[PDB]
Amino acid sequence: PAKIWCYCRMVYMPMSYLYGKRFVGPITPLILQLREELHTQPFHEIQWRQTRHRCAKEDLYYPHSLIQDFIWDSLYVASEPLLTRWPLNKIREKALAKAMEHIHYEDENSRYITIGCVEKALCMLCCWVEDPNSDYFKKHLARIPDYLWVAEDGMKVQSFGSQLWDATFGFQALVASNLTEDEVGPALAKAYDFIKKSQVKDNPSGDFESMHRHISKGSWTFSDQDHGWQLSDCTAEALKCCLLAATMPQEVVGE
Amino acid sequence: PAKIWCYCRMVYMPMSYLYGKRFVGPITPLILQLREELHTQPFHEIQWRQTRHRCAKEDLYYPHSLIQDFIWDSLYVASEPLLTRWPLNKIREKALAKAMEHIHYEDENSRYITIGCVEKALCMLCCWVEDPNSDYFKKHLARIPDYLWVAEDGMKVQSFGSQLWDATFGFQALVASNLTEDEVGPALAKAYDFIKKSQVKDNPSGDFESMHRHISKGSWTFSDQDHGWQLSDCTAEALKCCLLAATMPQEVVGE
Ligand SMILES: CCCCCCCCO[C@@H]1O[C@H](CO)[C@@H](O)[C@H](O)[C@H]1O
Numbered sequence: 084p085a086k087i088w089c090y091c092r093m094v095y096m097p098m099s100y101l102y103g104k105r106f107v108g109p110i111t112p113l114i115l116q117l118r119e120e121l122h123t124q125p126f127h128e129i130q131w132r133q134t135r136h137r138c139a140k141e142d143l144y145y146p147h148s149l150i151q152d153f154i155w156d157s158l159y160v161a162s163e164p165l166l167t168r169w170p171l172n173k174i175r176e177k178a179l180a181k182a183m184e185h186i187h188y189e190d191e192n193s194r195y196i197t198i199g200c201v202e203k204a205l206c207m208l209c210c211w212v213e214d215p216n217s218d219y220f221k222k223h224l225a226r227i228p229d230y231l232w233v234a235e236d237g238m239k240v241q242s243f244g245s246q247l248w249d250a251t252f253g254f255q256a257l258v259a260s261n262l263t264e265d266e267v268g269p270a271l272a273k274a275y276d277f278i279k280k281s282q283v284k285d286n287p288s289g290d291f292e293s294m295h296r297h298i299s300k301g302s303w304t305f306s307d308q309d310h311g312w313q314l315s316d317c318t319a320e321a322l323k324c325c326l327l328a329a330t331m332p333q334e335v336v337g338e
Numbered sequence: 339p340a341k342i343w344c345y346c347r348m349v350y351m352p353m354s355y356l357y358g359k360r361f362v363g364p365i366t367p368l369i370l371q372l373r374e375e376l377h378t379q380p381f382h383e384i385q386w387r388q389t390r391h392r393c394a395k396e397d398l399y400y401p402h403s404l405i406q407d408f409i410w411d412s413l414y415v416a417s418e419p420l421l422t423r424w425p426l427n428k429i430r431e432k433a434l435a436k437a438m439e440h441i442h443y444e445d446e447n448s449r450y451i452t453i454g455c456v457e458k459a460l461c462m463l464c465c466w467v468e469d470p471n472s473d474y475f476k477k478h479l480a481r482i483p484d485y486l487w488v489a490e491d492g493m494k495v496q497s498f499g500s501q502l503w504d505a506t507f508g509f510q511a512l513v514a515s516n517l518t519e520d521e522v523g524p525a526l527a528k529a530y531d532f533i534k535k536s537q538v539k540d541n542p543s544g545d546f547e548s549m550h551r552h553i554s555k556g557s558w559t560f561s562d563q564d565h566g567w568q569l570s571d572c573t574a575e576a577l578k579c580c581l582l583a584a585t586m587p588q589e590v591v592g593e
């Protein structure tokens with residue numbers, strides 16, 4: 084796990100837990116009346132072992148390799164006959180406990196504003212199926228309205244914040260443009276103090292080192308300081324903005 | 339196989355071949371309209387892995403042991419995930435060929451009047467699914483009317499012949515009973531010549547030895563000489579009959 088990308092590691096881990104637990108949601112009367120119209124054949128009177136490899140020709144960009152397909156096919160008969168009727172209690176329970184503790188340690192350091200709407204939505208189910216009555220679930224439910232957005236069309240969902248990146252770009256554009264009226268000074272200061280306050284300085288809570296994470300020291304995020312994720316792209320623009328504002332007079336922009 | 343009983347070995351071997359080939363008969367319109375009324379639940383909408391161990395309390399005489407059930411459960415996941423989607427070509431083909439050649443070598447020596455109606459019926463299907471157009475199948479079909487029988491009730495099926503055993507018992511009873519009228523001599527001779535002709539003297543065709551069979555030399559069967567199966571029960575009565583008839587005068591019973 085210390086080799087794969089961070090996004091894949093944080094997305095597939097709840098998927099791994101859900102697959103291990105084999106959790107299925109309750110079959111409401113809507114589900115039974117809607118599952119028939121979707122499939123072209125009867126719901127329960129079809130096969131599933133040979134239906135696993137059927138890729139559409141419209142949504143196919145990177146086809147699977149022969150080795151990957153062979154590995155998946157071998158794993159299907161290696162795991163399902165074994166860890167479903169005679170599951171290894173020790174191994175499976177340790178894996179589930181490690182996944183749960185890793186998710187709990189990750190969300191606390193991320194202030195429950197974890198990367199990705201899909202990842203947060205899946206983590207909410209992952210923590211709800213473990214304890215429907217807790218405080219982590221309630222706090223996850225509380226940050227849900229932080230992603231909805233409205234536009235000319237109906238309500239949409241914002242994948243992640245981008246205020247810092249656009250603010251830095253706008254500040255750079257304003258300082259590069261000639262100060263004709265010179266009245267942009269108050270706005271420049273009122274943005275510069277926010278930029279200074281947006282710097283992430285504290286280390287992640289707990290043993291962030293040796294936990295499949297990288298050291299963060301005076302780093303910048305892409306969305307906001309409440310996330311605490313290092314990203315070299317935004318830091319490079321922030322440093323340029325700070326250096327360009329450094330040569331500006333103190334009496335006009337402030338400290 | 340040289341350890342188990344002969345009847346079990348000759349009965350389960352066609353069962354083994356049928357299970358290995360996974361042969362299923364054609365689904366006629368009668369089958370689809372009759373498979374629904376039998377099962378209390380829908381035909382295809384039920385489970386089968388956990389339905390394997392459900393023994394009735396009326397037809398249970400020798401319950402399965404824990405070790406036997408564990409062995410079957412382990413074999414179910416050892417064989418089905420392996421030898422159904424990725425079958426060992428060499429091992430399975432050699433096993434099927436050996437079963438076919440063993441059945442063919444056994445039926446030729448048995449003159450197609452093999453032991454048991456169920457075993458013969460299963461062997462007929464086993465040889466038909468291999469070659470519907472042959473001579474062994476036709477000769478098996480020709481000996482079918484050798485088992486049907488009629489009585490006061492409707493037509494029945496006779497599992498095996500018993501003419502020799504009853505003939506020996508009747509001959510012993512007649513010779514033990516005092517010859518009052520002494521006119522039973524012609525009948526005694528007309529039965530004694532048949533008894534002499536009923537002795538199995540030839541060895542089974544081919545290499546009967548070292549083929550999971552026992553040596554037969556001047557043995558007797560239970561049904562008729564056309565079978566060629568050693569049985570110590572009938573031989574003991576036949577020897578007693580021969581010895582008791584030996585002391586009888588030659589001029590009255592013949593040679
Ligand atoms: C030291 C070996 C102990 C037995 C291991 C059996 C194979 C692992 O398999 C698991 O083991 C569990 C505990 O026995 C059982 O519930 C089942 O056999 C199975 O779930």
Ligand SMILES: CCCCCCCCO[C@@H]1O[C@H](CO)[C@@H](O)[C@H](O)[C@H]1O
Pocket residue numbers: 423424425426427
């Ligand atoms: C020397 C190994 C050759 C490949 C055999 C793999 C194990 C045998 O097993 C069988 O072999 C088939 C033929 O390859 C494959 O379809 C599957 O592995 C299986 O059906």
